[PDB]
Amino acid sequence: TLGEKWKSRLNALGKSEFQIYKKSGIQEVDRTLAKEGIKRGETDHHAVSRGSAKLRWFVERNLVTPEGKVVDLGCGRGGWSYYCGGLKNVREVKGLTKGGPGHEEPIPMSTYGWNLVRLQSGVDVFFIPPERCDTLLCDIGESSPNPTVEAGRTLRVLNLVENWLSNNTQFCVKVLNPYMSSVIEKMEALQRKHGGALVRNPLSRNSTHEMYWVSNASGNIVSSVNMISRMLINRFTMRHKKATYEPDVDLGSGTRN
Ligand SMILES: Nc1nc2c(ncn2[C@@H]2O[C@H](COP(=O)(O)OP(=O)(O)OP(=O)(O)OC[C@H]3O[C@@H](n4cnc5c(N)ncnc54)[C@H](O)[C@@H]3O)[C@@H](O)[C@H]2O)c(=O)[nH]1
Ligand SMILES: Nc1ncnc2c1ncn2[C@@H]1O[C@H](CSCC[C@H](N)C(=O)O)[C@@H](O)[C@H]1O
């Protein structure tokens, strides 16, 4: 596959060359003031991570429409959860994450709809019984310099979320490594069963081939993955290039009824 060629070439990059490549021609969120505020103890207004902006991209394009009971698998600090908490048709958000030493803890916030949002750490999501939900979010996948390792990890995530999906559930699931043959095969089957397609978020860094399986989209799996491999290869050739920034999400404040 093209992605394997990309991955091989990425792994051959020198340290400085890699850091440069990672950010070339990508989108970034202006996070400085929000982070400074969070550290100050401020709980209104702020996204807890750059993950809120990342989910906003899919949502404002209608590729996923969170509504009702939202489950957020691998919530971390709660960026996706808090974001979803403020959305018109959302009634409940449950976010679950590892946390603990070495991993990001949920951050208590008072952004708009926070009372709708419950976050628990100390949770391995692979061992919890699926619950009924109207939207399933998952942002899980640990990168590896070996794409076969990433394939194994992606398949586990895919079989994970397959257990939480019913007939007309909204969804946005990170596909850590969408280009490996075993993952293509699984995604093809999952698309027959549940529709949606793989979409590339321009806030993703060049060092990752991640695409997101979103419910409200169409597209041949192979072609959509290949298009991104090509793009990522093309980006090796950019010289003295850097990210373009955008303002952060304002998540407001106060409770919802
Ligand atoms: N040529 C390079 N490639 C790198 C480097 N760091 C990461 N990568 C590649 O990007 C991929 C995404 O990296 P990400 O930004 O998600 O960082 P992670 O730490 O989660 O990736 P891991 O694969 O878990 O790597 C862990 C660490 O291992 C080191 N690493 C990983 N791959 C390399 C390579 N190839 N060469 C030198 N050093 C490497 C580097 O310090 C990483 O921080 C990764 O799988 C590698 O294929 C790097 O420093 N040089
Ligand atoms: N098996 C597992 N169970 C629960 N959490 C997991 C997990 N494997 C990885 N994770 C967690 O999932 C998180 C993904 S971080 C995702 C960012 C988040 N969407 C945001 O907006 O802030 C990581 O913090 C990691 O610790």
Token pair of 56 as six digits:
């906003």
Q: Distance between CA atoms of 14 and 183, rounded to whole angstroms?
A: 29
- Which residue do the tokens 């070439």 mark? 9
Q: How far is the CA of 2 from the centre of ligand 1 (A)?
A: 19
**Contacts of 112 by beta carbon, 8 Å cutoff, 6+ apart:** 85, 86, 251, 252, 253, 254, 256
Closest residue to atom 11 of ligand 1, CA basis: 207
Residue 16: phi, psi to the nearest 5? -70, -40
The ligand whose atoms approach the alpha carbon of 83 most closely is 2
How many angstroms separate the Cα of 7 from the Cα of each of 81, 180, 229? 31, 11, 9
Whether residue 138 contacts residue 161, with contact meaning beta carbons closer than 8 Å, is answered with yes
Whether residue 107 contacts residue 48, with contact meaning beta carbons closer than 8 Å, is answered with yes
> What architecture is domain 1-257?
3-Layer(aba) Sandwich (3.40)
Closest residue to atom 6 of ligand 1, CA basis: 18
DSSP letter for 206, please. Answer: T
Residue type, 167: N
Closest residue to atom 1 of ligand 2, CA basis: 124
Q: Distance between CA atoms of 236 and 18, rounded to whole angstroms?
A: 9
Could you tell which of 38, 59, 104 is best to mutate to test the pocket of ligand 2, judged by most ligand atoms within 8 Å of the CB?
104
How many angstroms separate the Cα of 101 from the Cα of each of 104, 105, 107, 121? 8, 9, 15, 11
Q: Distance between CA atoms of 198 and 191, rounded to whole angstroms?
A: 9
Whether residue 3 contacts residue 209, with contact meaning beta carbons closer than 8 Å, is answered with yes
Q: Which atom of ligand 1 is nearest to the CA of 207?
A: 10
DSSP letter for 127, please. Answer: G
**Contacts of 145 by beta carbon, 8 Å cutoff, 6+ apart:** 11
